[PDB]
Amino acid sequence: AQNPNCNIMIFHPTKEEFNDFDKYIAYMESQGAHRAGLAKIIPPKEWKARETYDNISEILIATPLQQVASGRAGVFTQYHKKKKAMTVGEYRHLANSKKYQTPPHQNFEDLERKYWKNRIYNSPIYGADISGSLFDENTKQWNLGHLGTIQDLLEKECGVVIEGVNTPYLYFGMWKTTFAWHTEDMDLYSINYLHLGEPKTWYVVPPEHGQRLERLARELFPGSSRGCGAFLRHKVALISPTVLKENGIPFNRITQEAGEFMVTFPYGYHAGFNHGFNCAEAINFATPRWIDYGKMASQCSCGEARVTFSMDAFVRILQPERYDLWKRGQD
C-alpha cells in the first residue's frame, strides 16, 4: 500500500505532465496521496495563472464576514457576522491596518503558535465564497474555471443526467481568518489555488480516520452534536493541533504559499488559517473514486448547513432515501 503513514505529499509536475488534469489526479492517487486527505501541487515553472493581478481591487466583497469566536483557545466555535460590502481594495487596506495586520514573528512556526494562542481574542474579516475566477481564459492548464463538471462525471460514470452547474469561488483572507473543520459537500474533492499574498496553513485528518475526528468533535461540542447528526457540516468548529495530539487524533499540517495548488480528497477533514492578506480560488470536483464517498456522505438535516442548488441533485440520485428528510432541512 502506498503512503501508509498518510503523509501529505508534494508534487512537482512538469509542463508536459500538467496537461491532463484527470490523469495527474489519478497519478497522485497511484502514489497514495489521497491517504493524507490533502496534497500540494507546485505548478511547472513555465506556468502562470494570469499575467498580472494589477486590477483586482475592483472586485466586490458583497458580504464580508466577521469571524467571532467563543470558547477556549484550543476548542472554539466561530460565528459569522455579516458586514457592509467593500471592494477588494478596501479589504486589502483593512487587512494591512494596525488592528488587523500580521504581527511580528520569527517564522511560520512562531506565527502558528501566535494564531492558536491568540485567535479567539480577535475577529478577523473574511471575504468568502465569492462566485468568480481569476484565471486568465487563455490559461489552459489547471484553470479552475475550465474543469470537467461533477454533473458530467456522474453522467459518464452512471449514465444519469441531472441539472446543476459547478463554478469556482474566490476567498479573500487576512491574518487569523479561519476555515473550520469540514469535509466538502457530498464528500467531494476540492482544489484550491493561492493566487496571491500571504500563506495559508492547513491541517488535515486522513480519510481513513475521519470518524475519530467526528467522535472527538461530538465530545468537545456536545450540545451541537445533540442538535445535528452532522454538525461539522455547519463549518463552525475549531480544534487545535495541541488538542488533537492530546486526544490521539491522527493529522498533518502544511503551509501553502502563493502560486501553489492544494487538493483535498474525499472525506479528508481539513481546517486552517491565513497568515495575512491573500486571495485563493477553489472549486469542488469529482473522479470515479468519489462516487462511493458521495453515496455515503453524511448530511445536515437540522437545516443549518443549507446548501446549493446543485447538491440537491447529487442527494436525489446518490442518496434517494435521504432525499425527502434532507430537502425538509433545505426548505
Ligand X SMILES: O=C(O)CNC(=O)C(=O)O
> Which residues here bind Zn ion, judged by CB under 5 A?
228, 300, 302, 304
Helix (H) or strand (E) holding 220: helix 210-220
Which of 125, 144, 232, 280 is in the footprint of ligand X by CB under 6 A? 280
Q: Is 195 annotated as a binding residue?
A: no
Residue 171 binding target from Zn ion, Mg ion, ligand X, none, CB below 5 to 8 Å by type: ligand X
Rounded-to-integer distance, Cα 250 and Cα 169, Å: 29
Among the listed residues 249, 260, 217, 112, the one whose alpha carbon sits nearest the alpha carbon of residue 175: 112
310 binds ligand X (CB under 6 A): no
**Could you tell me how many helices (H) and strands (E) the chain has, helices first?**
10, 16
For Zn ion, which is the closer residue by CB, 100 or 221? 221
Q: Is 245 annotated as a binding residue?
A: no
130 binds ligand X (CB under 6 A): no
Q: Is 302 annotated as a binding residue?
A: yes
Residues binding Mg ion: what is the number (CB under 5 A)? 2
Helix (H) or strand (E) holding 39: strand 38-41
Q: Is 158 annotated as a binding residue?
A: no
Question: Cell numbers 449514465 correspond to what residue?
Answer: 159
Determine contact, residues 69/76, Cβ cutoff 8 Å: yes
Rounded-to-integer distance, Cα 151 and Cα 148, Å: 9
Which of 282, 286, 297, 300 is in the footprint of ligand X by CB under 6 A? 282
Rounded-to-integer distance, Cα 255 and Cα 42, Å: 12
- What is the closest distance, in whole angstroms, from the C-beta atom of residue 33 to Mg ion in the complex? 35
Rounded-to-integer distance, Cα 148 and Cα 235, Å: 26
Q: Is 117 annotated as a binding residue?
A: no
Q: Spell out, one character per residue from 152 to 191, where the chain touches ligand X: x when CB under 6 A holds, - when not.
A: -------------------x-------x----------x-
Q: What dihedral do alpha carbons 92, 96, 98, 104 form, nearest 10°? A: 150
264 binds ligand X (CB under 6 A): yes
Residue 264 binding target from Zn ion, ligand X, Mg ion, none, CB below 5 to 8 Å by type: ligand X
**DSSP one-letter string for 2-20:** -STT-PPEEE---TTTTS-
Among the listed residues 191, 226, 218, the one whose alpha carbon sits nearest the alpha carbon of residue 24: 191
Helix (H) or strand (E) holding 326: helix 323-329
52 binds Mg ion (CB under 5 A): no
Rounded-to-integer distance, Cα 221 and Cα 243, Å: 13
- What is the closest distance, in whole angstroms, from the C-beta atom of residue 98 to Ni ion in the complex? 31
For ligand X, which is the closer residue by CB, 193 or 326? 193
For Ni ion, which is the closer residue by CB, 67 or 190? 190
Residue 243 binding target from Zn ion, Mg ion, Ni ion, none, CB below 5 to 8 Å by type: none
For Zn ion, which is the closer residue by CB, 83 or 322? 322
Among the listed residues 260, 258, 142, 257, the one whose alpha carbon sits nearest the alpha carbon of residue 196: 258
Listed in sequence order, the DSSP H helices in 3-161 are 21-30, 88-95, 108-118, 150-158
Residue 192 binding target from ligand X, Ni ion, Zn ion, none, CB below 5 to 8 Å by type: ligand X
For Mg ion, which is the closer residue by CB, 54 or 331? 54
Question: For Mg ion, which stretch binds (CB under 5 A), given 54-62, 106-114, 131-139, 161-169?
Answer: 54-62
Q: Which residues lie near ligand X (CB under 6 A)?
A: 171, 179, 190, 192, 264, 270, 280, 282
Q: Which residues lie near Mg ion (CB under 5 A)?
A: 55, 58
Binding residues for 2-oxoglutarate: 126, 192, 200, 235
Binding residues for Zn(2+): 228, 234, 300, 302
